[PDB]
Amino acid sequence: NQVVTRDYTIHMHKRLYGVSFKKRAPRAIKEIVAFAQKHMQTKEVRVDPSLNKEVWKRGIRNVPHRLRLRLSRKRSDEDDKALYTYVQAVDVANPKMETTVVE
Amino acid sequence: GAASGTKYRMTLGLPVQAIMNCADNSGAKNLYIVSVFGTGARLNRLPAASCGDMVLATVKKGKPDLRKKIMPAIVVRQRKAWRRKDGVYLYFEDNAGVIVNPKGEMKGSAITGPVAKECADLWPRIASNAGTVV
Amino acid sequence: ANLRTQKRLAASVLKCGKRKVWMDPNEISEISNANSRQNIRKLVKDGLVIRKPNLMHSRFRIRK
Amino acid sequence: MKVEVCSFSGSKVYPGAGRLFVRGDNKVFRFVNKKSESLFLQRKNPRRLSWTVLYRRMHKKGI
Amino acid sequence: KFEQPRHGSLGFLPRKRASRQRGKVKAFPKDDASKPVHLTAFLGYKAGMTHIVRDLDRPGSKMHKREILEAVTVIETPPMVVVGVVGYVETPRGLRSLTTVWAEHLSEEVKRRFYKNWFKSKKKAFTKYAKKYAESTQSINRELERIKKYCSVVRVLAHTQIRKTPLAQKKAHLMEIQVNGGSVADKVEWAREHFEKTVDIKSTFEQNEMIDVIGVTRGKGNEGTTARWGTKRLPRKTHRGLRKVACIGAWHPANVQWTVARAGNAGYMHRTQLNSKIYRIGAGDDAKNASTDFDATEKRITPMGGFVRYGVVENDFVMLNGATPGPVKRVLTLRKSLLTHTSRKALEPVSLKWIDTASKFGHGRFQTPAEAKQFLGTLKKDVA
RNA sequence: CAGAUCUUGGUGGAAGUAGCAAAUAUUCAAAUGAGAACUUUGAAGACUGAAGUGGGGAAAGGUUCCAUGUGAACAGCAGUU
RNA sequence: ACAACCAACUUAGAACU
RNA sequence: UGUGGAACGGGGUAUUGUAAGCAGUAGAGUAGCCUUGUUGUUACGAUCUGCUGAGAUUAAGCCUUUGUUCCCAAGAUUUGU
């Protein structure tokens, strides 16, 4: 059951509160990576380019307060005993929702 | 100044060199605060006054016989807000004062505009010559 | 690989700037073997190298 | 022990809330907060803003 | 020339961080043997501040029989559990502890004070002592009798019930509280009877009592001389900065004097504030905690939305006029006054008329949710 | 020769210290590679905003131009460039 | 003396908001 | 392994001020067609009105939660009267 996929909502506002404007988008990427690392227990996190586009959609200093992310812990083309997390973006109307196990 | 007793400490909004309106009918309009009675010794601190104090002022605009001289005056209104013992912060629309003598008796006869309760209670002559009190 | 020479040749062939030169990321090996203007033209004909369209500068608000 | 009413926002004012402004025409105004006081200084009408009780009463909000 | 007073007091030195956070009693009240056996200190947690409107009872004052608004500090004081007794001999080198007697069973709260990694540990703190208490019942009596005959000074060990507070910390605060009754034998007997028992705040302090609050002030880190000592700002023309002191010293003595203001730590210091008056000892079991005789609303001592960064006070609390050192949720030490209060201000009974329960999270204007509902009528989230 | 603020050369404490902060700003994925924050490709976000960080020349330089390889020294961090 | 459109930028004024 | 923690969600508390969308001839007026009009048919029109004390934010050093989903019973170093 190591291979799994879950949809989370990350509250980016409280993580980007006191951050400088020129570093908000890069730090949002970093906090997303740490967010995926903590929840999936995998040290290797790959961010989808479309998710990076979504994070950078409104510039470097205007990141959405909440982001609907899809975290997929899965196998890699490297050794078959290493787990890594792949993070995507989910298109929803209201991102205010609970975490769901997707199948 | 041995008028009616003691006054509670209030925020000082009228330091030296402040220009305030003259609320009496003595013919003055531009009371220029020169010094404040009861000011202690403290380095670099400008002597400031609030409502009910006994500042020393000169007349910059008004009747010529009232200018080029120092006369006692009492501050009746101030723009700076001050709180009372009941926890109410209050302030007026302008800084105003009335020309008096060292004994506290007003040189004028009538007071234009509202007056502070602290000043009215401190000086009976001002209370007698004033209308609306706060 | 290193496609700096190929991008410069593609810009010269397409008569556009290097900012408007698009190269297929899935054909890096094929693009890297061009090394010539004739091969760049072959890549353009095959669609592996294209000229990106100009950025939008609409004048609807100005006209209104 | 009396609760007053703000001159601008018309809300209940408990002791130690807001400020008191005495105008030159002997009129006393009670402001419940700096927002109401600043808006009064900016000469905003309390009947125009939708969040004031005066507006709601004049526009029959609540019935 | 132009003489001016000193900037700061050379009595609160060094201006360093305090070596403690709980706050300790540096001097207990002088013991009077005629008085009944009682404690001289208590521990609480600062919950926040609020308003108080009361009628002044000061003859000769302009505000006599008038309304006055004063700021008060709320300290939540749940009952403290007594778990030990300490006896102090009176050697010519000072007070010296002779022996300590502990209760049969110590709760998890007080036992966590003895550990830095409680969960990782085996929790074998009072194991052999508990075995000795259970199966001997002779050495405990021997030590108590030793404290009876020797140990002119007797202090009990009491720990706070921090689990009843809305605080994330589970480690209770343990403190030695002196007993200032008489008959050192009776003091030991009182401690033995109160072993594993809870002493309440109303049994230690009473209404209108003047006490002292002991605690560590808010931490502020390093600070320049301008804000650390109140020195004058240098002119705008000053090269290489102005928030400093111009002349740090003269020539011979060719050293920087200890009396000169220097940059450094400016917070987190141990302070004892004298003459704090108890305005209300409220109990946590009644719904009229914040009500008065002139305001009969059924409300407790908590602003709507909760105390800022503290929570909801559900235990006994003490309301003190003015401010106390330390930030919110910090543990504070309440100590009985060492002085005698004969002034009219100290002896004046205090009758609260209204207690503010509006939200401290903003410009709150409602005292109760019922009042908020009455004013706002029905909302969109209420109609459907 | 112990001196001459001696001559030439080598080497210390300061010291892993001062510092490597002007010119708005980088991010994600892939390829290569032993090694990728600096290489290349794609995508996004930006700047120069035509008196430009664009395209050319005069003076001056002299091969710095181009391709293919390398990463010993230089590019005050790194390097597959 | 009338006059069917195309192709132009200004200036001044009024009401409303 | 626990009156456990975390990520969300809910409620409360606060800030601002009535979101988008729809509808209304309310709207200074303007322009075409005919049964020719004391709610004219057609279209545009800053703005205004009703859904709407709405919408948005709400810890990042606010409170609370019985809700949903995960995580922990690990690893390394030192220590003897």
Side-chain angles (χ1 to χ4, degrees), chain A residues 18-36:
Chain A
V19 191
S20 300
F21 287 152
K22 279 279 166 287
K23 325 222 63 154
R24 282 179 100 93
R27 200 213 161 92
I29 290 294
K30 290 197 172 182
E31 307 263 26
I32 281 181
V33 169
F35 174 89

Side-chain angles (χ1 to χ4, degrees), chain D residues 1 11-12 14-16 53, chain E residues 51 67 353-354 365 367 371:
Chain D
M1 206 36 233
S11 33
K12 302 185 69 66
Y14 285 81
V53 281
Chain E
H51 273 162
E67 302 268 275
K353 299 183 71 265
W354 171 75
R365 50 185 182 121
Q367 303 294 311
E371 177 185 2

Side-chain angles (χ1 to χ4, degrees), chain D residues 23-54:
Chain D
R23 215 165 56 191
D25 56 324
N26 310 279
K27 211 158 235 183
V28 188
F29 294 86
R30 179 98 236 191
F31 309 115
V32 79
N33 54 4
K34 188 200 165 186
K35 167 171 65 174
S36 57
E37 184 200 293
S38 304
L39 261 45
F40 183 85
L41 291 171
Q42 292 167 21
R43 280 268 210 69
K44 281 289 311 142
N45 173 226
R47 312 161 335 191
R48 270 275 212 176
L49 302 183
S50 177
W51 56 278
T52 62
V53 281
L54 290 90

Side-chain angles (χ1 to χ4, degrees), chain E residues 13-33:
Chain E
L13 283 182
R15 294 276 163 103
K16 64 179 293 296
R17 300 169 186 177
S19 293
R20 71 191 64 85
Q21 178 153 127
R22 164 163 51 91
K24 66 163 302 176
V25 169
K26 304 281 192 59
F28 283 103
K30 169 222 73 93
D31 196 4
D32 185 17

